[PDB]
Amino acid sequence: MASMERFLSVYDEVQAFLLDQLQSKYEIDPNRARYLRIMMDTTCLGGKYFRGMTVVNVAEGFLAVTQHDEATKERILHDACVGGWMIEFLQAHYLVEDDIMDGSVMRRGKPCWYRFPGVTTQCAINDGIILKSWTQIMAWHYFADRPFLKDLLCLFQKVDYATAVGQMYDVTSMCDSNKLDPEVAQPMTTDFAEFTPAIYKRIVKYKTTFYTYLLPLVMGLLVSEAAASVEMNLVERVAHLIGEYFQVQDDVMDCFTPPEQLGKVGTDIEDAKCSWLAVTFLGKANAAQVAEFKANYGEKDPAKVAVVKRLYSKANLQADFAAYEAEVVREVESLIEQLKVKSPTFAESVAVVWEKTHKR
Amino acid sequence: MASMERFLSVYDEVQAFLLDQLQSKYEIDPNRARYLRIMMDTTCLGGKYFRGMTVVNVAEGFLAVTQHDEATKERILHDACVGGWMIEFLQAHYLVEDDIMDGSVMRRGKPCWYRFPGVTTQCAINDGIILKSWTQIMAWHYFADRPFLKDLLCLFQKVDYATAVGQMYDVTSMCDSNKLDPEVAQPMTTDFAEFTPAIYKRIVKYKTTFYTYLLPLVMGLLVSEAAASVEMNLVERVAHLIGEYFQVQDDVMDCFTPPEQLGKVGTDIEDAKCSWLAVTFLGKANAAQVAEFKANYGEKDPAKVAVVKRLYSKANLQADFAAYEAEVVREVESLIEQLKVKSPTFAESVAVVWEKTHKR
Numbered sequence: 029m030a031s032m033e034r035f036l037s038v039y040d041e042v043q044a045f046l047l048d049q050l051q052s053k054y055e056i057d058p059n060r061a062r063y064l065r066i067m068m069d070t071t072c073l074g075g076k077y078f079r080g081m082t083v084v085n086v087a088e089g090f091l092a093v094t095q096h097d098e099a100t101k102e103r104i105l106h107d108a109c110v111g112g113w114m115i116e117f118l119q120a121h122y123l124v125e126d127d128i129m130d131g132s133v134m135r136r137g138k139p140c141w142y143r144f145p146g147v148t149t150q151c152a153i154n155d156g157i158i159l160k161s162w163t164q165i166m167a168w169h170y171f172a173d174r175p176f177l178k179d180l181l182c183l184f185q186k187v188d189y190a191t192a193v194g195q196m197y198d199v200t201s202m203c204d205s206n207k208l209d210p211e212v213a214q215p216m217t218t219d220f221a222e223f224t225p226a227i228y229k230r231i232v233k234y235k236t237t238f239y240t241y242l243l244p245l246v247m248g249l250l251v252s253e254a255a256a257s258v259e260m261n262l263v264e265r266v267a268h269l270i271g272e273y274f275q276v277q278d279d280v281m282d283c284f285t286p287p288e289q290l291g292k293v294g295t296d297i298e299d300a301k302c303s304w305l306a307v308t309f310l311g312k313a314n315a316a317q318v319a320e321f322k323a324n325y326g327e328k329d330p331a332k333v334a335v336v337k338r339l340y341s342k343a344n345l346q347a348d349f350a351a352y353e354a355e356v357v358r359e360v361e362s363l364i365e366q367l368k369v370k371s372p373t374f375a376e377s378v379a380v381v382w383e384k385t386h387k388r
Numbered sequence: 389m390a391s392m393e394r395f396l397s398v399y400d401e402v403q404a405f406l407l408d409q410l411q412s413k414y415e416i417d418p419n420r421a422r423y424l425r426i427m428m429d430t431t432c433l434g435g436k437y438f439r440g441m442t443v444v445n446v447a448e449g450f451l452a453v454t455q456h457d458e459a460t461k462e463r464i465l466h467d468a469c470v471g472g473w474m475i476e477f478l479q480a481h482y483l484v485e486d487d488i489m490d491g492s493v494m495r496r497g498k499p500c501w502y503r504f505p506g507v508t509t510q511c512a513i514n515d516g517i518i519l520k521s522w523t524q525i526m527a528w529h530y531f532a533d534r535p536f537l538k539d540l541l542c543l544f545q546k547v548d549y550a551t552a553v554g555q556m557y558d559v560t561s562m563c564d565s566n567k568l569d570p571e572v573a574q575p576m577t578t579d580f581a582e583f584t585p586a587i588y589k590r591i592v593k594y595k596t597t598f599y600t601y602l603l604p605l606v607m608g609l610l611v612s613e614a615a616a617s618v619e620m621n622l623v624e625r626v627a628h629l630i631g632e633y634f635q636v637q638d639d640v641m642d643c644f645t646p647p648e649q650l651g652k653v654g655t656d657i658e659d660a661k662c663s664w665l666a667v668t669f670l671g672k673a674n675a676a677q678v679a680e681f682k683a684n685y686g687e688k689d690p691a692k693v694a695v696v697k698r699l700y701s702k703a704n705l706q707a708d709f710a711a712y713e714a715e716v717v718r719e720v721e722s723l724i725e726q727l728k729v730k731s732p733t734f735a736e737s738v739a740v741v742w743e744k745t746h747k748r
């Protein structure tokens with residue numbers, strides 16, 4: 029069976045299980061089960077499934093080199109699918125709540141969930157809660173007797189928490205740290221002293237890399253009982269490297285990709301986000317360019333957003349990007365090498381993960 | 389050591405642990421650690437700690453009748469405190485997000501968290517996420533090697549999920565079920581056909597009773613290794629009974645308790661909530677009273693909210709309440725009796741839980 033068709037079948041199975049359980053154990057009525065079915069589909073489906081499919085790919089890698097009964101191969105693949113969906117639903121929770129937090133309009137060329145007419149924020153916040161809750165329901169049902177249960181739950185728990193911490197670092201990235209205070213409304217930075225590479229890297233490490241790269245790779249290893257085939261410090265390193273790269277592309281696209289292809293009107297400039305573009309521009313700008321960026325950044329006004337796009341264009345950030353891209357290609361190749369000392373198989377899975385990131 | 393002083397000490401310990409971990413493992417800076425410290429304190433402290441303290445009381449019950457080394461008594465009490473705080477922080481998550489969902493203004497005579505000037509909704513939604521995440525961090529740190537770890541996590545997971553389902557039943561309680569649809573903005577019911585006792589009971593069972601009564605009682609049993617001293621079906625039954633009673637009081641107070649003593653301006657009428665008052669009033673009203681209630685319920689206008697209060701006053705709902713209260717007193721006493729067949733100790737803890745509910 030092809031990997032994707034398997035993965036999607038398991039979605040239907042998991043859906044049926046969740047909704048059936050709601051009826052038998054939580055007293056749900058048919059109409060509210062229908063609302064939750066629609067919410068699930070709308071929030072969990074329509075993407076590329078890159079994350080969930082990475083768990084399946086890693087597991088398939090190991091299957092090709094490890095002796096097992098056919099029923100065990102099936103169980104492993106079914107576990108990798110279930111695990112893949114836990115990450116997809118975790119993502120879905122974070123996109124629902126982030127979209128509400130950020131006042132976002134669209135996502136993937138469709139309205140954000142909370143904007144649907146029969147949803148509203150009042151229900152969407154709690155729908156997002158449920159999305160994450162279903163990750164735990166899945167795990168305890170399908171993995172109840174599995175040896176990896178505790179390691180999987182503890183890892184998932186830490187990556188969820190890292191993710192929420194990342195969100196905090198992202199939403200507070202335009203404030204001055206010394207001024208954070210629940211009692212006082214937060215001014216936007218005027219010095220941009222905190223728009224540095226290290227500060228950027230911390231935001232991206234936590235807000236994206238743990239759930240997008242570390243978790244799929246390590247879940248793949250856990251459902252394969254293969255964690256001893258890797259040096260976990262190397263899996264971490266490569267994950268952060270690849271994840272940082274992924275985000276830099278997303279940061280570049282928010283500004284320069286046309287909204288129809290993007291799935292979104294980009295607002296990082298107006299939101300004063302600590303993007304790769306802002307940081308890289310500040311890292312090469314002259315005094316006059318810095319003052320012009322400060323006078324225009326983080327304002328709704330289109331004339332000022334255009335001035336910021338103009339400064340980025342004239343600053344030749346394509347050069348800085350190609351240079352970054354070079355160095356990442358270099359570092360990721362070294363780490364893949366270091367990954368072959370213990371698992372050719374695993375190193376190859378990371379190679380595929382890198383190819384799918386580095387192309388898109 | 390008195391129970392409360394213990395409980396509060398452990399808060400400080402747990403806080404220190406969480407924030408120290410953020411610094412050593414999640415790269416937090418001092419200012420953001422301060423913001424999270426303040427968020428924690430503001431959202432987790434200032435209540436009566438009824439929930440968390442119930443875990444401690446149940447554990448203390450068992451300590452009085454079970455032979456243990458002193459260091460084991462301490463470990464049990466420390467575990468009951470940690471477990472108590474997991475429930476308090478779970479509550480804190482739900483109050484933060486509910487207050488945002490409902491557009492609430494005050495809670496406990498202070499502004500809701502999201503209304504603080506340096507918070508805003510953008511951060512509060514994610515602060516609420518973190519609150520729940522800290523429940524898992526606590527459990528995996530303090531209970532790592534405990535035999536009850538898996539049972540505790542699986543129970544906590546199910547009660548969290550019940551709670552979110554309860555929230556869904558509560559926020560959708562003024563809509564007609566057959567009309568729920570993410571695509572269509574939801575009209576308020578015009579028939580109030582779904583304002584029944586059974587429908588009420590389902591909302592309260594899930595939205596309140598599982599986290600407020602079932603979880604503290606059962607956590608108490610789990611940290612005591614005492615789950616075999618009870619018939620779990622009876623613990624469930626008594627929990628739902630007592631929890632339903634607790635909510636009926638809260639429903640009555642929302643309408644009739646003056647806002648300074650309440651901690652809150654009550655808006656259940658304007659919000660068209662399926663309250664005990666609405667359901668009990670509909671269960672005894674004549675045709676003209678029903679039409680007057682329909683013409684005024686679920687509107688912001690003070691004149692109409694007063695008309696609804698007037699209808700409730702003239703309808704003599706104090707009689708229905710005393711009758712309900714009677715029957716609950718009766719049923720809870722029977723269940724406590726049925727609880728003594730296996731644990732006098734546990735039945736007594738439930739007796740205390742009932743006395744603290746039935747008085748306030």
Ligand SMILES: CCN1C(=O)CN([C@H]2[C@H](O)[C@@H]3O[C@H]2c2ccccc23)C1=O
Pocket residue numbers: 052053054543546547550598602606620624
């Ligand atoms: C502790 C014993 N107990 C209950 O009190 C409820 N019950 C089951 C309910 O149908 C649903 O699944 C289980 C569960 C646990 C917590 C919340 C919701 C649920 C159960 O096992």
Ligand SMILES: CCN1C(=O)CN([C@H]2[C@H](O)[C@@H]3O[C@H]2c2ccccc23)C1=O
Pocket residue numbers: 183186187190238242246260264412413414
């Ligand atoms: C899987 C191996 N691994 C990591 O990649 C990161 N690391 C630790 C980090 O300091 C923090 O605690 C642990 C953890 C797990 C997930 C997210 C965040 C954290 C760790 O053990």
Ligand SMILES: [Zn+2]
Pocket residue numbers: 126127129130198
């Ligand atoms: Zn965001």
Ligand SMILES: [Zn+2]
Pocket residue numbers: 278279282
């Ligand atoms: Zn972006």
Ligand SMILES: [Zn+2]
Pocket residue numbers: 486487489490558
């Ligand atoms: Zn509410």
Ligand SMILES: [Zn+2]
Pocket residue numbers: 638639642
């Ligand atoms: Zn209330």
